[PDB]
Write a protein that binds this DNA or RNA. Structure first.
Lengths: 82, 96, 92, 107, 80, 96, 92, 108
DNA sequence: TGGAGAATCCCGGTGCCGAGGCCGCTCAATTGGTCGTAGACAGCTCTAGCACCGCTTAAACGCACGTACGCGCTGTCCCCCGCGTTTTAACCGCCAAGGGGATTACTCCCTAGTCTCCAGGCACGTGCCAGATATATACATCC
DNA sequence: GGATGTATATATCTGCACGTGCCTGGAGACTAGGGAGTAATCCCCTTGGCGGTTAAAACGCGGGGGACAGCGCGTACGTGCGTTTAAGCGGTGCTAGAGCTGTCTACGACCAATTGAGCGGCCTCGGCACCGGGATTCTCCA
């Protein structure tokens, strides 16, 4: 049972992702909000990926399931088949 | 000694991480997070490596776009520092 | 002879709100709502059949489309109502 | 031939199983359509219509009216979180908007 | 010609009052007119394409409904 | 007598959010629709339901945009909306 | 086994840039682009055929799907090569 | 019989007309598929492929590279307005972002 | 404004692994003929859309006061950036088990297709109940 | 404490729901064939483990800069009132053209034989990642 892996998305990783977004200065309460946003987004994609897995009667979540889940939410991903 | 002014290393990092294409989150903690999230839906579940790679690419792109909108919201309030209210404003205007 | 869901939404409305009527624009809205939800669920089931190399739409595909489309409690109660409907249709 | 019992009657439904089956067949969704798919789909549509009509009837009785107008449907959809999530990109004609004023604008 | 001025200042004021706006700048109205012109240009262009595909010279409500549904602005109540 | 600046605005907010009626006059919007459609095809006809559908969609879109504009004005500690708030709302929405 | 637009986009690349190659990931992304645009145009043409009560997808359906989906200059040019290719196919 | 001339060869195309035709038949789009529809669709797809590939080759040449990587495809799509409008809700994997530092963040 | 330390840009050498080309084959595109039906075209009709007129009246428009409020300036102090050192776990290489995804054979039940037939659903018609309107009183806000 | 917006209550009038005849589409009943379930197999590939190493995260500390509160000021919308104007409602009329029906014919589905283009497998070489050293910005402080 995996517990408390949201702290693995570290403050330097969120700082790097803000650097790619063009952010010069970052507050200290940004990281908890970014972790919550990431958890909500990953829950939304992973629920549809698991649903696509369970419809195919498989025990593995394939990349094409994640591509279908992301194409569902208008976030189509290029490079993992389709 | 030598100490740079606050902001120069930030702009150098902005140029460095906008010139590059590497994933900015470590792969093993993201993988553990994906298994922890997916264990709440179906237990005893496996993942392809390309599935976790697709999840990482999508999550990083979504967070980078969110931080761009957050920076726009921070500039709109006569600031250069991003705050959680900017994230909340960007997400409610997007409709999430 | 345009077909519509007018008498059926009449029947559901009188089944749950007996002393309550409905207007013409409201029934145009409800007909559009039923058609839109039908198109969403049928399109998601068509995609689900095409992804799994299947040429038929069964109760499993429409159930998965309901789970993909509807939010949590709505999806749970729609799954429960439809499973009750399929079991009653097969039992009779 | 025996008595013609409809597929909606033997399933205990009000929406037509046969019409839903016909629109599934000629809608170019799949090459084949199973027997339980129109029954399941008409049950789901009947449930969603029932939920909308429950909340719209409550909104109509809140405005002291016994006839459901589009404003009552709009209040019904947007006052529930799941129905607002399902109908987020949907504009209801003659529905208006809900009364919301931000707290910084009050005196 | 010059029919964008028919969307008057009190019309934009009423539209913002329905949106909850308490105070409105004087440069809001030209911006809102440009926004309305861009939105109407997109929907009308798509509806005209749907009309001329059907070899008709009359823009129906069905064309406007499909033009709005193409852009994720689905409208209930006009035959959808 | 004279009312304070803001109370008639709040009364209008409470009035127009309680109604469903179209806030734009019908004939100027119809003339604007026929002026815009002249660039795409010469000598076009319109059903009345088409112009009514266009007016309902345009009014709903403008009301939602003014809600996001009001959020953007409040985020910069203002009660007055400005064109930069409209531009920021359309930028975060993806329309610019 | 698996089918993809691998050799064709390479042929187009050597037609356009004869001294420029491609990688495998850029190949998969271009294949996904062709598949997604094909799905968009074919779905729009299916919807256009269903709206006008037609059971046939013709070149007119693809033409108005390109006009609906692609932006302005892209749509005008793509209509021009589509019409040119259909004219060359019918004439020979 | 005669020589088996490819439908793409008599249409002046590089994309396969027959594969677009089988994908239109088996994709559940209509009961009937016309003859000129796959020719038109293959021409449109080939034009869009060439439009992305020309700009991606230009972006690869501007970065002193021979082969095309997903960074060059991302730069080609995002630097063209019509391609960014077409591909706006699509993430290119290993593509990165455009270099864009805001004017109020630069030092004076 | 000059100059020191840090960072960035640029050129030559080395290896590696992934792109690019060649070959066998196989399955899927092509070719040729047949057939049934979808759609193109012609005719008609009657429906709704456009064009104009008159009035009356609500709403748009011009203008004046003035007050709140957007915006610029100043202080302060706390919070976050930069850098150094320690810790920790990510990452790479490798090595095994073993679940499970993918393929093949078969076999059966499920669904397309067709003929017949009757009952549900739709268009038409009517008459009656639910809101819209108008006016006086008191409740609720406003300054 | 006085002055206005607005529930609240009563009459009144007009523009959704029930009934019915036709009709057409769903249902009963039967056949045929092929799509998917099920069992078996096998081999990719996913997970779990160990160890070294080293790169990145975490903690601490100094300091500076920017977020935030306060304050003045000048101006630009809010509000109100008189004037103008054209939206809107009702009416008339006329012709485009949307929509339905009928006929015929071209065209796409379908089937069978043929054959060649594309895909898997394999081999090899050059584009490029990396490293090291020097030339050129480049930022900050005297």
């Amino acid at each position: 049972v995996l517990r408390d892996n949201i702290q693995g998305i570290t403050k330097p990783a969120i700082r790097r992702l803000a650097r790619r977004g063009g952010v010069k200065r970052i507050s200290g309460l940004i990281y908890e909000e970014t972790r919550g946003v990431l958890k909500v987004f990953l829950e939304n994609v992973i629920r549809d990926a698991v649903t696509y897995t369970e419809h195919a009667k498989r025990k593995t979540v394939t990349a094409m399931d994640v591509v279908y889940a992301l194409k569902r939410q208008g976030r189509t991903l290029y490079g993992f088949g389709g | 000694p030598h100490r740079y002014r606050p902001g120069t290393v930030a702009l150098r990092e902005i140029r460095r991480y906008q010139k590059s294409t590497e994933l900015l989150i470590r792969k093993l903690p993201f993988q553990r997070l994906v298994r922890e999230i997916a264990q709440d839906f179906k237990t005893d579940l496996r993942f392809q490596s390309s599935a976790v790679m697709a999840l990482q690419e999508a999550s990083e792109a979504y967070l980078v776009g969110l931080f761009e909108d957050t920076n726009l919201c921070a500039i709109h309030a006569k600031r250069v520092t991003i705050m959680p209210k900017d994230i909340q404003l960007a997400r409610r205007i997007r409709g999430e | 002879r345009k077909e519509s869901y007018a008498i059926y939404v009449y029947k559901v409305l009188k089944q749950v709100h007996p002393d309550t009527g409905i207007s013409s624009k409201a029934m145009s809205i409800m007909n559009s709502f039923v058609n839109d939800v039908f198109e969403r669920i049928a399109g998601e089931a068509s995609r689900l059949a095409h992804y799994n190399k299947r040429s038929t739409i069964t109760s499993r595909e429409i159930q998965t489309a309901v789970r993909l489309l509807l939010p949590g409690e709505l999806a749970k109660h729609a799954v429960s109502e439809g499973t009750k409907a399929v079991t009653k249709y097969t039992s009779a | 031939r025996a008595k013609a019992k409809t597929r909606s009657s033997r399933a205990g439904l009000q929406f037509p199983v046969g019409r839903v089956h016909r629109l599934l067949r000629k809608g170019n969704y799949a090459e084949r359509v199973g027997a339980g798919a129109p029954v399941y789909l008409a049950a789901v549509l009947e449930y969603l219509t029932a939920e909308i009509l429950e909340l719209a009837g409550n909104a109509a009785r809140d405005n002291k009216k016994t006839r459901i107008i589009p404003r009552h449907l709009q209040l019904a959809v947007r006052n529930d979180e799941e129905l607002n999530k399902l109908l987020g990109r949907v504009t209801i004609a003659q529905g208006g908007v809900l009364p919301n004023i931000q707290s910084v604008l009050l005196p």
